[PDB]
């Protein structure tokens, strides 16, 4: 299970790539989606590789994120342990965060918007002109590297 | 004409003589020099001239370069000295010139050039350890009559 | 052989046993082929249908198993050929085969040939094969009458092993009548 986060805008980006991002339920910059790790989903991220920032998040971080940025399918409501318990198949945020990572269910399956609408990275990101290996912020990340971003964009 | 007009590789490979006519003959006199009866392996030293950039060298440059390079070996080692130089490249690329404004602009055949990629051996000489300095000077004069910079790399010779 | 560009013929064309050009025109009918094949001492007749992995033989008849019902004469003549054809045609009726198209292979379409004699027999058996009556041999030559008249020019017996002196085209009649009979263990 990977955390996809668009870092580069739509202007000038190829249509076949933009459509893929939209197929991955992410329509705006700074929007995050929790994508599994299958052959299919793999092709999609590879295509988006240069306009996104992905990686496997730590259970802890995924919890801090879900708690702060997750939303119902329709609604302004807060997704907290109590919320999770009442509508999901889990007992709290941690229970959910675990099943997702283990790829047992999906945010949509549990009545949650497939998109985690994050906030701009606090203290700025490492740059959208270079990948991670070159000191930039695009492409695949370390679990610790992905956490730094998500935590920064909580 | 200046080599500025033909030094770059920016056109299709134009070589098919079965479709091209009136191609000016190669100014290149000989490709094998020195003692073409003796072999390369019969020599302890093998120094080649290497082109650093990918270019197109006209037979006019090839001949001018090769000439002034071998002419030094003949001077410093004698007309029948103990050496053997080689020019491994041949002028295959036919050249045109639109010499009528831009209407019906496909030019007429003016010459031929040899296509060489960077890091290639334009020349390769084979000599003895003593005369290995007259070979380096031969190439020093040779790389001045061609468009790109070059490397005079010794391939066989720990005798330095 | 010589290299990459070389073109090696199809195995059965290489072996020179199958004419693919006639085979295609033959397969265009959609009917089973009545494969008529000969040999120096024998003559067989197969009923071949197409298939995924290769040809499919549903019925057949070798001149060898002709003696199985009473044949005591040789196995490479006109009476032999016709009688093999008729046997084959009967075994074919049994498997449900109702029509066929004569396939003679690399053999020549000569008037009165043993292949046409085979075709004549299979049709007599109750099969439907596109034929041409005047290309078939006359009834008596099919009986082997021309062979008996040859034995007439005796002085030295025609058959080494004793079958009889003047030969018997009547043996042909006996056996043909034996096959038309319903009983017979096909």
């Amino acid at each position: 299970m990977h955390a996809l986060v668009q870092l580069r805008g739509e202007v000038n980006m190829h249509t076949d790539i933009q459509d893929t991002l939209e197929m991955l339920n992410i329509h705006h910059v700074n929007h995050c989606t929790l994508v599994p790790e299958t052959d299919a989903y793999r092709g999609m991220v590879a295509k988006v590789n240069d306009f996104v920032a992905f990686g496997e998040p730590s259970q802890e971080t995924l919890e801090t994120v879900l708690a702060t940025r997750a939303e119902p399918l329709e609604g302004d409501a807060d997704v907290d342990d109590e919320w999770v318990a009442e509508h999901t198949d889990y007992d709290d945020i941690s229970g959910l965060a675990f099943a997702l990572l283990s790829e047992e269910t999906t945010l949509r399956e549990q009545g949650l918007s497939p998109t985690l609408r994050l906030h701009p990275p606090r203290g700025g990101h490492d740059g959208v002109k270079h990948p991670v290996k070159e000191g930039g912020q695009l492409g695949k990340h370390d679990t610790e590297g992905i956490d730094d971003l998500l935590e920064a964009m909580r | 004409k200046p080599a500025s007009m033909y030094r770059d590789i920016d056109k299709p490979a134009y070589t098919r003589r079965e479709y091209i006519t009136g191609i000016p003959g190669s100014k290149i006199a000989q490709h094998k020099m020195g003692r073409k009866q003796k072999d390369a392996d019969d020599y302890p030293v093998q120094i080649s001239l290497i082109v650093e950039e990918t270019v197109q060298l006209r037979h006019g440059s090839l001949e001018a370069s090769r000439l002034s390079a071998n002419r030094h070996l003949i001077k410093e080692l004698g007309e029948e000295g103990d050496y053997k130089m080689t020019l491994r490249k041949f002028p295959h690329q036919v050249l045109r010139e639109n010499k009528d404004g831009m209407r019906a602009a496909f030019g007429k055949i003016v010459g031929t050039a040899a296509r060489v990629q960077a890091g290639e051996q334009l020349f390769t000489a084979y000599c003895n350890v003593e005369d290995a300095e007259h070979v380096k000077e031969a190439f020093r004069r040779a790389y001045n009559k061609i468009t790109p910079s070059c490397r005079i790399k010794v391939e066989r010779g720990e005798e330095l | 052989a010589t290299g990459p560009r070389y073109k090696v013929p199809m195995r059965r064309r290489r072996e020179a046993r199958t004419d693919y050009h006639q085979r295609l025109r033959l397969l265009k009918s959609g009917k089973p082929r009545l494969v008529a094949r000969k040999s120096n001492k024998h003559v067989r007749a197969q009923l071949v249908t197409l298939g995924p992995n290769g040809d499919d033989t549903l019925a057949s008849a070798h001149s060898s198993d002709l003696a199985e019902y009473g044949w005591e004469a040789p196995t490479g003549n006109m009476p032999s050929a016709y009688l093999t054809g008729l046997l084959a045609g009967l075994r074919a009726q049994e498997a449900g085969v109702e029509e066929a198209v004569l396939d003679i292979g690399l053999n020549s379409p000569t008037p009165g040939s043993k292949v046409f004699a085979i075709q004549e027999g299979a049709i007599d058996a109750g099969l439907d094969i596109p034929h041409n009556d005047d290309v078939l041999a006359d009834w008596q030559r099919t009986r082997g009458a021309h062979i008996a008249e040859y034995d007439e020019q005796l002085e030295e017996p025609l058959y080494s092993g004793d079958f009889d002196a003047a030969d018997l085209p009547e043996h042909f009649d006996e056996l043909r009548e034996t096959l038309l009979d319903g009983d017979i263990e096909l």
Binding site: - | - | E15, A16, R17, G105, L106, N107, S108
Partner: protein
């Protein structure tokens, strides 16, 4: 073993390549069977503009007709060593050629399942001179 390896005469072809015929008569007499015309291809500057047209004639003698013809033909010829083909064939002369081969040449001349004769079973110039010489004449 040698029984199926001992050579025989396949055919004796007698021909008279003229060029524009009246010679058919003589061959018919000396051999003993009917002759056939000889045509040619490709235009020739030696008055041969008409492609397919009678230029000569030939006769292919087999069995008795061949041997009986050779009992009187061979003597008239002064045989030599360089007069042989690598397959054990010889032409001398009016031309007379003899095709010699081993007891199973039908395999290569038949229609069905024909195969070319193996080099080992192919006749040799040596076995040729021998066989011939062993029948009323001399070599070299």
């Amino acid at each position: 073993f040698h029984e199926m390896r001992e050579p025989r005469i396949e055919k004796v072809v007698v021909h008279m390549g003229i060029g524009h015929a009246n010679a058919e008569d003589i061959l018919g007499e000396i051999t003993g069977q009917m002759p056939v015309r000889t045509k040619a291809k490709r235009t020739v500057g030696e008055f041969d503009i008409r492609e397919g047209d009678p230029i000569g004639a030939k006769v292919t003698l087999r069995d008795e007709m061949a041997e009986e013809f050779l009992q009187t033909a061979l003597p008239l010829a002064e045989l030599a060593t360089s007069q042989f083909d690598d397959t054990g064939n010889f032409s001398f002369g009016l031309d007379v050629t003899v095709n010699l081969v081993r007891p199973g040449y039908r395999v290569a001349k038949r229609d069905k399942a024909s195969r070319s004769i193996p080099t080992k079973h192919r006749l040799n110039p040596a076995d040729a001179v021998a066989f011939i010489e062993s029948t009323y004449d001399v070599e070299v």
